């Protein structure tokens, strides 16, 4: 017994947007940075555009539309909203432009300039996003610093919904069949039994914050993924990041409990990081913290952020 999903899938015309430049090139297709100018609205909207490869399998399209299905059914400040799709010879997915790209890349490039206030703020925002996903009974199933985008250094959003699943109101657990999977982010219960929960997302949340507090270090690097299940069973966990007070690290550890019900709830994480965010230098010890500072076309006059463009 679930509510009808009355979200609107918007169909865009190829004429309504112009692609300025190429963010990335993929086997699947090319991702473009461009502007979306809805017809006769006198606004221009920074967008990221996927244009799928000319040779597109019927599986790859059926899979991509699921991602669009999800990204369209979400409305939250800390989740990437999807503006619409374009049904050209190759389908185009259209999302809000996240100029600073991947959060993982961002921490790697800026570690010297990143301060406790930002880190903790990020932890909170991701927790809010994930909490919203729980309200929508959604399980992301692939949360990692690679899948959080940076709109501004002070505003990050969760992304990459390709693996996301929906739970029947009765349904409590998700059972899956073999596919490529992010072993080093996964709950143990997921690796052993292909089981996913809102709580298995918390585990991945744990790993995600750990990525941020190590400035982009690779979890369980040097050890092969085939070994991970046996190692968690032993009780071994990721080490405490150098900048991390026990308070923060405690919290990560809790995400990695084995009794999944013993792990914290995203709403609780929101609360804990939010307390900590108030007094950042008490909870993260970073050299030079007190002094760190963090932050085209001329057609900019009419530009509006997707976040301010509401339908």
């Amino acid at each position: 017994g679930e509510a009808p999903n009355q979200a609107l899938l918007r169909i865009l015309k190829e004429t309504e947007f112009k692609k300025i430049k190429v963010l990335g090139s993929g086997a699947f297709g090319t991702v473009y940075k461009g502007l979306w100018i809805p017809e006769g609205e006198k606004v221009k909207i920074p967008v990221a555009i996927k244009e799928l490869r000319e040779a597109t399998s019927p599986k790859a399209n059926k899979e991509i539309l699921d991602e669009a299905y999800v990204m369209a059914s979400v409305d939250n400040p800390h989740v990437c909203r999807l503006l619409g799709i374009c049904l050209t010879s190759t389908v185009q997915l259209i999302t809000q432009l996240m100029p600073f790209g991947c959060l993982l890349d961002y921490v790697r490039e800026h570690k010297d300039n990143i301060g406790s206030q930002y880190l903790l703020n990020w932890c909170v925002q991701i927790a809010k996003g994930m909490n919203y996903l729980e309200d929508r009974r959604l399980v992301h199933r692939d949360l990692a610093a690679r899948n959080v985008l940076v709109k501004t250094p002070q505003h990050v959003k969760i992304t990459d919904f390709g693996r996301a699943k929906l739970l029947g109101a009765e349904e409590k657990e998700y059972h899956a069949e073999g596919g490529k999977v992010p072993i080093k982010w996964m709950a143990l219960e997921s690796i052993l039994h292909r089981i996913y929960t809102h709580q298995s997302d918390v585990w991945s949340y744990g790993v995600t914050v750990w990525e941020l507090m190590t400035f982009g270090s690779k979890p369980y690097d040097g050890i092969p993924a085939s070994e991970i299940s046996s190692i968690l069973e032993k009780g071994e966990r990721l080490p405490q990041p150098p900048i991390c007070t026990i308070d923060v690290y405690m919290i990560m550890v809790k995400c990695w409990m084995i009794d999944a019900d013993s792990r914290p709830k995203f709403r609780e994480l929101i609360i804990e990081f939010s307390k900590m965010a108030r007094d950042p230098q008490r909870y993260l010890v970073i050299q030079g913290d007190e002094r760190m500072h963090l932050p085209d076309e001329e057609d900019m006059d009419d530009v509006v952020d997707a976040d301010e463009y509401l339908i």
């Binding site: 990692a144 690679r146 490529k180 999977v181 992010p182 072993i183 292909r194």
Partner: peptide, 9 residues
């Protein structure tokens, strides 16, 4: 990154 995703079967 591709090296993070391992074929589960």
């Amino acid at each position: 990154d591709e090296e993070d995703y391992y074929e589960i079967p």
